[PDB]
Design an enzyme around this catalytic site. Structure first.
Site, short mmCIF file in Angstrom:
data_model
loop_
_atom_site.label_atom_id
_atom_site.label_comp_id
_atom_site.label_asym_id
_atom_site.label_seq_id
_atom_site.Cartn_x
_atom_site.Cartn_y
_atom_site.Cartn_z
CE1 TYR A 6 -4.35 0.87 -0.51
CE2 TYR A 6 -4.49 -1.35 0.41
CZ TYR A 6 -5.06 -0.30 -0.29
OH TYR A 6 -6.34 -0.43 -0.76
CD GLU A 40 -4.78 4.97 0.16
OE1 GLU A 40 -4.83 5.66 1.20
OE2 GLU A 40 -5.76 4.34 -0.28
CG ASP A 55 -6.35 10.07 -24.88
OD1 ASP A 55 -5.30 9.40 -24.80
OD2 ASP A 55 -7.47 9.58 -24.62
CB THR A 105 -2.86 3.68 -22.60
OG1 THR A 105 -2.67 3.75 -24.02
CG2 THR A 105 -4.33 3.98 -22.26
CE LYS A 132 -4.95 2.58 -26.68
NZ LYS A 132 -4.87 2.57 -25.20
NE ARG A 150 -4.30 -4.50 -21.23
CZ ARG A 150 -4.60 -4.14 -22.47
NH1 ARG A 150 -5.45 -3.14 -22.69
NH2 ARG A 150 -4.06 -4.78 -23.49
#
Lengths: 405, 405
Positions: free
Chosen positions: B51, B53, B197, B223, B226, B232
């Site tokens: 974790y 955060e 984008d 992303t 690609k 991913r």
């Protein structure tokens, strides 16, 4: 690893540090666990290469025959584990699982009733700096100031006054069993949906050690990485009547391509949870938490709610005139990882706090038992009663090392 | 794999099918690629257990020293790759990267101007069944009906008429270079933010084969999976003046715990992209796409915009009296994976379409070159001109097998 060390020495060195760190420290972050090598292998698979928007047999890309098998294994094993009519295993996280349910039944500005964030409620249960509190009108119910148990008359009064469209039950820092029946009764009274966020307790529910919200809730959300001991991600469970709507909320609503490799890892984790030995593990988690609670009380610590029914506990450090921040810092110095945590009706800010949150899921996974719980409590006592003694802290350091081998 | 085969035979068998499938098929999904073994190893690491955060040096959990190193490597390499002042490597996906930018600068109901979804725009650029179109008031600009190139006078007119708070440039199916300078000029005229984008073209931008949006855009989203050939996930780039706001939008705004193992994999992918051989690879992607385009035209196919400047092309199948759905189906029968795709001013529904979308990133990664492009085009011609001949389809099947070895 074989290829990472040669390709990326910098990344490999950092990962190796982290791996060694995970072995060396006493990890008491209530939300953490250690996944199996099988789970990790699934995450490290070629499934990351596959675009699979849509759902099994209803994808928007060809060639999904095999990732369909994987997702269906995840969904079917989840349904076995929790007795739900429908599962959606695509949520990227707890945040997105919760986001999707909100997107399904609420419009912008709708009133939602959740647990007070300083009493155990999660960030995504209405924080004004989180999408939940910005997008929807959150009101809160509280715990009793003495028992620290959810005040169900307060849940009821807030529901009747504010008329929420949705009531959220469940918590990131609530050490007692939640009465889902009472939540549903109140929800029924005011004509509200009931959502249960079982993220923390999901493994316990699967092992029959906490009442199952599935029969009482319209929607159940969860993460896969806490007591469920799976990969990092989310899941939604619901009755068949909401299946289409929930699925549409995840895609095309709030996400795109699912993480098929993580979904594979979810399937693996669910497979593990279905085994008898997971049930034994979950019992030891709860047994260990009770033992740690009792041992901490033996050391003279006050616990929020006076103990625990689950994997986690909160220490109220006010009798020791310590803040959670101070305790967190000094425990870090000796190799014990905890969170500072707001206690109910905490006089301190959420950035300082009067408490620490501790959970046993991780240490239980590494094979710690009751004797180890006694020693952990004794080390915490040694440290927190002697924050100004470097010799005490060095002793603690040595006792921590002795536990982790 | 070592542990998965024993722990979970069902999951392992499905993964193995998928792995073999990825080798056997000619994968032309424009958004897909094949990641390195190093990238996968990073994803399959123990970092899933952590974790974290918050951000490096500013976390809400102790023990983040090493995952901090990993995230910082990702951020710094991203900044090197794209020349951005700030990177946020935490977004779980393209969806969440876009969601975060919207959350940063827009209020519910604000007007946003994006690319027409039937002309190349993405689902998250304003679909009425996506959060973008439900949460914000999307209007659209179009491409020229003859050239299929973005009509910048239309971008300008829509901006001046509708007065959007944000303009979005970039696409999931646009085969030509986008003029970011013109987008910024229009944005400046109407006092709108510009978001680009670059998800599809990110690898090409990194290799200097497409103009970089970073100098022209307030926000750049992408992303990592690609043309960038990474794991991913998502990423946001922005100027320093928006860094705090963007970071707060991701957390505590729209996400919780980041996927530290995926962030490790991002760092690895960025490291690979920084190498000279990635630049050679990206050039071959573009070279191969041009070659495939020309070879398809030689077969008698009409291409949207008359060709391509990037990794992808769209075939307008109307001269062959075929729908994209029909073409997608029959190509699947011979082992070639494409998407059906709406063409500009398509007479068919988005569920039927008059086109197919093809990209060369994946086949280029596996080592395909110009000769392979000629053969792929020849096989597509054979199939689409003989959809009723099982002998033609079997020949295609054999020629596909010959290519994949």
């Amino acid at each position: 690893m074989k290829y990472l060390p040669q390709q990326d020495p910098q990344v490999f060195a950092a990962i190796e540090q982290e791996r060694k760190r995970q072995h060396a420290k006493i990890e008491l972050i209530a939300s953490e666990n250690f996944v199996s090598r099988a789970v990790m292998e699934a995450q490290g698979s070629v499934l990351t290469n596959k675009y699979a928007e849509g759902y099994p047999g209803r994808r928007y890309y060809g060639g999904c025959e095999y990732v369909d098998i994987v997702e269906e294994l995840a969904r079917e094993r989840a349904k076995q584990l929790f007795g739900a009519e429908h599962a959606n295993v695509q949520p990227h996280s707890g945040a997105q699982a919760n986001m999707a349910v909100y997107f399904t039944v609420l419009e912008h500005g709708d009133t939602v009733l959740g647990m007070n964030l300083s009493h155990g409620g999660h960030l995504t249960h209405g924080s004004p700096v989180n999408f939940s509190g910005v997008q929807y009108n959150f009101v809160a119910y509280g715990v009793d100031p003495e028992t620290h148990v959810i005040d169900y008359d307060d849940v009821r009064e807030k529901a009747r006054l504010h008329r929420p469209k949705l009531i959220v039950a469940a918590a990131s820092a609530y050490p007692r069993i939640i009465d889902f029946a009472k939540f549903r009764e109140i929800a029924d009274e005011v004509g509200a949906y009931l959502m249960v966020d079982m993220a923390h307790i999901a493994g316990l529910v699967a092992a029959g050690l906490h009442p199952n919200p599935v029969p009482y809730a319209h929607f159940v959300t969860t993460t896969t990485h806490k007591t469920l001991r799976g990969p990092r991600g989310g899941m939604i469970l619901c009755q068949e009547q909401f299946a289409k709507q929930i699925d549409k909320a995840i895609f095309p609503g709030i996400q795109g391509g699912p993480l098929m490799h993580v979904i594979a890892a979810k399937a693996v984790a669910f497979g593990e949870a279905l085994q008898d030995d997971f049930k034994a593990y979950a019992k030891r988690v709860v047994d260990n938490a009770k033992r740690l609670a009792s041992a901490l009380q033996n050391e003279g610590f006050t616990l929020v709610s006076g103990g625990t029914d689950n994997h986690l506990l909160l220490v109220d450090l006010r009798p020791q005139q310590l803040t959670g921040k101070t305790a967190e810092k000094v425990l870090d110095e000796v190799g014990i990882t905890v969170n500072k945590a707001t206690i109910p009706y905490d006089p301190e800010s959420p950035f300082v706090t009067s408490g620490i949150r501790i959970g046993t899921a991780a240490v239980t996974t590494r094979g710690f038992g009751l004797e180890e719980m006694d020693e952990i409590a004794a080390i915490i006592g040694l440290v927190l009663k002697n924050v100004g003694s470097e010799q005490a802290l060095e002793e603690a350091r040595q006792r921590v090392a002795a536990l982790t081998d």
